[PDB]
């Protein structure tokens, strides 16, 4: 039985407070940190403008210590029964968007209990999650989708995809070597300041077009010697520059014209880009409620089309995207829905339509490495957890290296089959 | 006894390999990661890099990892040393290596084992690592929590522009608690990043290696003014002090005995003697609330340090001067060159030698500032080291990037854990060991 549940405030990778939760059982202390968090679950912030600019989480922490913690202990639920725990947490909150107790308060307890549940089983968390998710063996290690060039030019994320590598360990080496070439290249062509990094550890040179970013990544891949072995992925994050009033997308939404694209015109740009560069995945190509545009694009595209703001890890929105045939992959952010169990349901719903699933970090991350075990446990074959820079990003990649070494031949690298890794 | 010792390669915060060591005992698994060091230059302990230009640009650590797995591990298990006896463990490690600079087995291999064993020794005693280190170092209770020296703005070889000085830090020493000191620094940092974006363009918000901003700044006064304005916007003028790392070895011209404040391209007529550079520090310290200056003069310009020490009432911190090396500390005490040590455990290579360097500094009433490296990891050992040494000061980055925050979060956990049995060093950081 649970003996202690205690939460505290800690700092995420951008210097903002977030919730860390301790759950103590007979097996020891089990700890999880929640990452930073329009349709997603409601994160509770203090809103006191004199403290952390209003971004405190003292109220969410208090909800864990005074309400969730004492209620869950008294209920005495087996920590291995994750679905029962999360059902009780949502019953305790009682709101659809988790606005009573806070999505950050609920998720922190949900993830720390999951680690207590695995430990009572005597297995690593990824094995516990595979049990919960019903995913088959051997374990599959994910392809790291590495955001080495940070934007948002309009497009937000430019990722390298080392899918040809024979192992996860080698894919990381290739990505690390490409990133080092890219950083030198950015400094050479754009000045010393272009080597400084964005929130997720990629370089952010002052560049104008998508083709400029892709050319720089292409040259770095060639300098590293991996042309043809490393693919490219993008997160457009097009909701950032959609003007719903006129139904047009403003690629120059940073400078305050008639250069605004319809979704047919924007789709033309993606098709031109995908036919020139080895782009294998595009995330949020259209806005979070521009369902018509997504369905139009899905019909012609043979590459991965990832919902992020479209789906917000929400089984209800996933169902709509399946029915309208709007996308074929889910970006899975556990704190967009608020419990481990609903996150797993989101994954299973996607798998049922043969979607890919890409387990994802947030731009405000921590030293917590839960999503590495989630990606392996879900057999997703894909993870998005940053450039190989800043340790809130490397910590997840380091954790997968430990899992890889621990599993040996009982794990396979998803490689080029990342879109179908669950059935690999 | 130790049942297993095993090393692997992981990635540090700059994307380069480093050594992680596991030590397994009856209390469980005990793990440590080594920060980035130096494999060339022959200043600090010698880190072992693979040097294969086809792998990680030559920065692999497979050979160091192999040294732990095939040489150190088997030998240490067979030696059967009590894991709580850190001095005996580290004595054995240095005996195995046999070189003064740890270049046989690699300083990164040796320190990795040294730190993972230290955690195993703490767990055998049933106490957190900071308590074990307090025992090893002989520091008194209550525990003292360190003031964070936070490098929020960068210059020198890190950034463009003419700004020669390397690190500009905020020092929340007036705060009543460590938790409040972090909040203040976090709020000041957010103000500073907005100001840098406003005054220098959006690209100025992107961060350097340690999480600070690095816009194109020309002069030291320009940088200090930006920090001053951020402190005022956050409402903490007079409660937060300023510290600098000049890293003056980066622009010392040893053949001419002059410092080039425009070494990023420069007029040799504008080059400064150490007396002229000391004048600049004195002017800045009389205008701004600068309470600590690191490496004001070059790593072997002993005459300049001693000249500056004689007149200065603020903290003078050796980094390249002292390289956490007890021999160079003894020389600095004897010549009265500095009054504080930057303590980088991986510059000397064992926990025991690090603790000795701190005690040697304390014996001359020095301050001790436990320090990160440029290449850090998610490891938080130096947080426990700062508390266990009762140093009252830690330098572990801006409040940005989790290889920096992880240390700060760990001190938050220690603060909550200790309660009244800990006090925040506050304005007494220079003398916290005797607070
Ligand atoms: Mg996105
Ligand atoms: Mg220094």
Swiss-Prot record, chain B:
- Which keywords annotate this record? Allergen, Cytoplasm, Glycolysis, Lyase, Magnesium, Metal-binding
**Has UniProt tagged this entry with the keyword Iron-sulfur?**
no
Which Gene Ontology cellular component terms are annotated?
A: phosphopyruvate hydratase complex
Provide an example Pfam family for this protein: Enolase_C
Give the UniProt record's GO annotations in the biological process aspect: glycolytic process
Record-listed Mg(2+) binding positions: 245, 294, 319
Q: Keyword Cytoplasm, does the record have it?
A: yes
Q: Which NCBIfam families match?
A: eno (TIGR01060)
> Which family does this protein fall into?
Belongs to the enolase family.
| Subunit structure and binding partners | Homodimer.
Recorded protein name is Enolase
